[PDB]
């Protein structure tokens, strides 16, 4: 809970998580996160395949 | 290099306006803040702010706060911390806080006021 | 403030690595509440012998040094001396009021 009188004001004060619980794909609509790993390839589950109608 | 010490313990009595008058050393009063601490011989540095000299903004804090105007000239190097209207309240050692940017730490040899008066 | 119930003093009869912890009743008493570990005497070295509780400051013989060894800010009385002898007090000066430790008497 560290806290430093430098800025008595909460403003400059710059509050970053970071995390990686569980893992998501990345996409434009998301910066660059700090992981740039955990490549786990799980599968989409359906598929476009040819039926007949 | 902290000497801003108070003016010796000044006997003008209360209601007067004493002059703690801790006049900085070289310890960048104008670069770093100089606090002022109205405050007994071992009573801790009871800051009248964390007096940011450096700084724009002077974070007040009250435990000197209080008759006790930190006359603090950041140029001169001097938190003469003029105890203007000074109450019963002058008669403790001014340690006066190198407040660098509103940081109150330092002290110095520091005099004090005395709000009272006695006879010669 | 952060109150600063300042353990009373730094233990030591042979000039020898002491530590005169300054506790704080509130919190830590640490930069934050600028316990500046110091060594104040009444006129003697009145100053902050530690600078923010974290590094010997204007008053210290090293013996007022700057440490936070716990919530007590020790005014760190290394090789501490009959000169190094002093009410290091960590006198926090906090943002908010003083709230400065009582004493930890160096001797």
């Known amino acids: 809970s560290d806290h430093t009188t430098t800025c008595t004001d909460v403003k400059q004060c710059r509050a970053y998580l970071i995390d990686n619980k569980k893992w998501v794909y990345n996409s434009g609509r998301l910066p660059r996160g700090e992981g740039d790993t955990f490549k786990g390839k799980l599968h989409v589950p359906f598929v476009p395949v040819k039926a007949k109608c | 290099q902290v000497q801003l010490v108070e003016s010796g313990g000044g006997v003008v009595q209360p209601g007067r306006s004493l002059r703690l008058s801790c006049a900085a050393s070289?310890?960048?009063?104008?670069?770093?803040?100089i606090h002022w601490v109205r405050q007994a011989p071992g009573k801790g540095l009871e800051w009248v702010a964390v007096i940011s000299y450096d700084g724009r903004h002077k974070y007040i804090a009250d435990p000197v706060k209080g008759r006790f105007t930190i006359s603090r000239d950041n140029s001169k190097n001097m938190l003469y911390l003029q105890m203007n209207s000074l109450r019963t309240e002058d008669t403790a050692v001014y340690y006066c806080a190198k407040d660098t940017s509103g940081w109150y730490e330092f002290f110095d040899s520091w005099g004090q006021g005395i709000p009272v008066t006695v006879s010669s | 403030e952060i109150v600063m119930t300042q353990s009373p003093a730094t233990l030591s009869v042979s000039p020898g690595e002491r530590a005169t912890l300054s506790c704080r009743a509130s919190q830590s008493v640490a930069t934050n509440v600028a316990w500046y570990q110091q060594k104040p005497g009444q006129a003697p070295r009145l100053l902050i012998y530690?600078?923010?509780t974290r590094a010997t400051g204007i008053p210290a013989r090293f013996s007022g040094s700057g440490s936070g060894t716990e919530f007590t800010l020790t005014i760190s009385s290394l090789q501490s001396e009959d000169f190094a002898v002093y009410y290091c007090?960590?006198?926090?000066?906090?943002?908010?009021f003083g709230q400065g430790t009582k004493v930890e008497i160096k001797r």
């Open positions: 007090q960590q006198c926090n000066d906090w943002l908010t």
């Open positions: 530690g600078a923010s």
């Open positions: 070289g310890f960048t009063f104008s670069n770093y803040g």
